[PDB]
Amino acid sequence: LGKFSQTCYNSAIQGSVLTSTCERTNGGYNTSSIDLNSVIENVDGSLKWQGSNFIETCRNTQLAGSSELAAECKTRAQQFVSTKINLDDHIANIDGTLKYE
Amino acid sequence: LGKFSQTCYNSAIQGSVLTSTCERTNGGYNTSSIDLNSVIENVDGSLKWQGSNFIETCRNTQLAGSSELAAECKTRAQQFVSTKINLDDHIANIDGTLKYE
Numbered sequence: 001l002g003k004f005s006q007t008c009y010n011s012a013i014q015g016s017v018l019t020s021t022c023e024r025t026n027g028g029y030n031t032s033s034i035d036l037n038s039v040i041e042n043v044d045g046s047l048k049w050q051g052s053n054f055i056e057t058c059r060n061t062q063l064a065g066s067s068e069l070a071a072e073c074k075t076r077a078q079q080f081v082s083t084k085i086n087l088d089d090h091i092a093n094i095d096g097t098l099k100y101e
Numbered sequence: 102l103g104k105f106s107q108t109c110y111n112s113a114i115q116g117s118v119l120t121s122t123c124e125r126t127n128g129g130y131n132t133s134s135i136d137l138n139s140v141i142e143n144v145d146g147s148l149k150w151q152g153s154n155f156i157e158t159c160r161n162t163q164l165a166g167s168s169e170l171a172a173e174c175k176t177r178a179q180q181f182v183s184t185k186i187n188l189d190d191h192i193a194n195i196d197g198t199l200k201y202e
Binding site for chain 1: 102103104105106107108109112113114116117119121123124125126129130131133134135137138140141142143144145146147148149150151152153154155156158159162163164167168170172174175176177180181182184185186188189190191192193194196197198199200201202
């Protein structure tokens with residue numbers, strides 16, 4: 001997975017766009033770029049690799065306790081993980097209607 | 102932030118949709134549902150709160166060395182902090198072109 005920099009060089013970032021000159025399988029080089037905006041995100045100040053849609057990659061979603069979303073979610077290696085998240089962290093009651101904050 | 106469960110009852114998860122009977126600012130009960138699909142994501146098997154669009158909430162992006170993207174990104178409390186991520190984690194050279202895997 002990854003490791004572009006081992007066989008590429010003259011790399012540059014301009015905003016979210018990475019450009020690099022990379023060795024071809026059968027010889028010679030090619031310059032290309034990739035826009036990282038759809039795959040990297042800012043999570044509370046940290047750059048992180050964007051995850052997947054949970055309805056697509058998790059099964060058996062259900063409420064655990066009174067406030068927790070639980071599911072079995074796939075790793076990038078297709079192993080299932082038992083996982084919980086507390087909806088009380090960012091889900092509020094505003095005047096009777098559920099809202100995110 | 103949050104704490105919907107202190108003032109809501111009969112809470113239900115249907116797929117990505119959360120439903121609850123909630124208390125209203127000035128009495129009575131409200132029933133709302135909210136879709137968690139846009140605010141929670143599956144990160145490597147873990148349910149996590151989804152972050153922000155990076156080019157919209159970060160600045161001063163640069164490549165630090167051969168493969169580290171460095172930036173200043175805004176935290177939830179609106180402060181800029183320094184952060185980096187290793188592009189070699191998921192950016193590959195596929196026959197001379199840059200690809201995410």
